[PDB]
Amino acid sequence: SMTCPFYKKIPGTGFTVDAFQYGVVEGCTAYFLTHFHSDHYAGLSKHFTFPVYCSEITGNLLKNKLHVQEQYIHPLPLDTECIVNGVKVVLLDANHCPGAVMILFYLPNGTVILHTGDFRADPSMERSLLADQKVHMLYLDTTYCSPEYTFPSQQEVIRFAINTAFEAVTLNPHALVVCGTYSIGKEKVFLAIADVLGSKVGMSQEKYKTLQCLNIPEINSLITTDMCSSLVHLLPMMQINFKGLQSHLKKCGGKYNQILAFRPTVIPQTKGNISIYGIPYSEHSSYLEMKRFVQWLKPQKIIPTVNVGTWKSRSTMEKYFREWKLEAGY
Amino acid sequence: SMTCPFYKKIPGTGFTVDAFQYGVVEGCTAYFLTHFHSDHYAGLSKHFTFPVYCSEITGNLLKNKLHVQEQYIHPLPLDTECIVNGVKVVLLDANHCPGAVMILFYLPNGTVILHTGDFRADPSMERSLLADQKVHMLYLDTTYCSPEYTFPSQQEVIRFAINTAFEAVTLNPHALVVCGTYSIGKEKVFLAIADVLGSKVGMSQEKYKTLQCLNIPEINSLITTDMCSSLVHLLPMMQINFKGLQSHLKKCGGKYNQILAFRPTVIPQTKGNISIYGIPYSEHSSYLEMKRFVQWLKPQKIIPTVNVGTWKSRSTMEKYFREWKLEAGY
Ligand SMILES: [Zn+2]
Ligand SMILES: [Zn+2]
């Protein structure tokens, strides 16, 4: 009996969010997709025949990577009042990956609901349409909802990578910088690295086609499939190990004599002319970022969407929410 | 300067093996693909316009999963003398994954070369066409070419899984058995589990379509997309953790009240009504299996195809080969 979970349903509507892996959801009048990560689009394919509401970047990926039929894809602009089945909704930048959004639902009866999808809370969100009215219910990405989860800011990670890469290529003009990636994400990191080095980013034709879906301005002048004309390469995450990088260095035919690689997980692992830096890159809120966003939003009700498998996890999170509400006075 | 490595070239011919990620390989007259693993087919797509020689199962996957054009796919039968560009070749079962083959090349000048692709050496190979003549050069999958690498036989792993599953469902008829999988592989494990339980294997429509490509006899009577009509489910490897399995148990709506899961890596990790067994499943030769195969084949020359990134690794392997040759007297 495949059952869609509670945290994927929008109360007072027939709306679901990221609920494509349960077959036909009874009484669902509109299916939203917050972003193009396989955990969330799972189940979508060329055989799907209900309307999918999503951002334009997400729509491009649905069309070109999953071959969802164009007639069922309903892309919506960001930061704009839109209507779906008589209900007003706004898509907000989730600061997660390209095309990723939070969804703000304005119920005709006056209730206002935010579904964050996956997000990394940011002070800029306090400047968004969220500011213009009271938000009653919050469906919250609680991936790192525990005080242990501390990591640097996105800008700190990018600054570290820029500095490390610039210095390494300064000391050795024959060095190659490698960034590991999945299908999307990390664009701001590897584009900044290539920028400081005055280089395009080299990659496979498949990764190149993927980046064409992302509406990045002037993208063709930033990326190339001609690998050996660049100083920065993208490789699959699973190749970022000494064996995989030695192999890539051999594959480049002597054009480079050293690789410096970054991967998400600071002192590098070094074996000869290969070095690997694990960087604390994250597409989700830290505990403190999350706490700040929630104390600013002051929702009446919070529904966690992640780590809700046991009672202990759910109740520990409810405890933090009560403490937050007490300290901020709502 | 993208360069195809030496271990992917067949000497005395214009043949390459699993060399699709280097653009046009200069002077390559025929491209072989040993099996459908992304490390090996990497680079293949609908835009490829040279002939690809492979098994029929691999050909099905190329056509239906990668949309390689049918006119460039050249499937060949197993255990059968075939001709490619005037050269006689045989495809042999590699005992690796469905459709995976080793390739035996019969050069017009009398030289005989075996490329194992990925393989798990088996005594049955000693009964193959390999027996009928002397093999001069061996391009060897050396994934676990180190004495530390010991693990049970495939039959021992399958027997353990059958027994554990049968006993768990005997003690609790409401339990669910889960097997984690990538795109292909492990069929003999999860089909045997379902067999002993008198059940079909439930799975997503995507995994169902994949298994239809594998020429498994009577397959439609062994698998289903109607999950809750079965006792054995397949999930993505990355979902095989307590959070992912708790979530799946919720998704099944109370049909089951317990999950017992197997994954490749014996005492289970248990948290309440979820248990996870790491099983030492392998699609590659153990050190001892490899040693036995090579001492039986007695090749004049061995060329390792894996772990050849450093001199230390290459020379350590050459040392084992010399010791093997000395002990067996060739
Ligand atoms: Zn995500
Ligand atoms: Zn393989």
Numbering used by the authors:
A (entry chain A), B (entry chain A): 698 to 962, 976 to 1040
Please give sentences taken from the publication describing this entry.
The protein exhibits two structural domains: the metallo-β-lactamase (MBL) domain, arranged as a sandwich of two mixed β sheets (α/β-β/α); and the β-CASP domain, which is characteristic for a subset of MBL nucleases: CPSF-73, Artemis, SNM1A, Pso2, as well as RNaseJ.
Structures of SNM1A were solved in two different crystal forms at resolutions of 2.16 and 2.19 Å; the structures are virtually identical, except that crystal form B is lacking two N-terminal amino acids present in form A (RMS difference of 0.57 Å). Comparison with SNM1B shows that all residues involved in zinc coordination are conserved; all are in the correct positions, except for D736 which is a different side-chain rotamer. Remarkably, the reverse side of both proteins is predominantly negative. The electropositive surface regions in SNM1A, identified with Roman numerals in Figure 1C, can probably be attributed to the following residues and structural features: (I) residues K1022, R1024, K1029, R1032 and the dipole of the last α-helix of SNM1A, which is non-helical in SNM1B; (II) residues R697, K698 and K699; (III) residues K743, H744 and K760; and (IV) K940, K947, K948 in the β-CASP domain. This segment of the chain is partly disordered in the SNM1A crystal structures; it is possible that the ordered conformation is stabilized by, or dependent upon, the presence of the ligand.
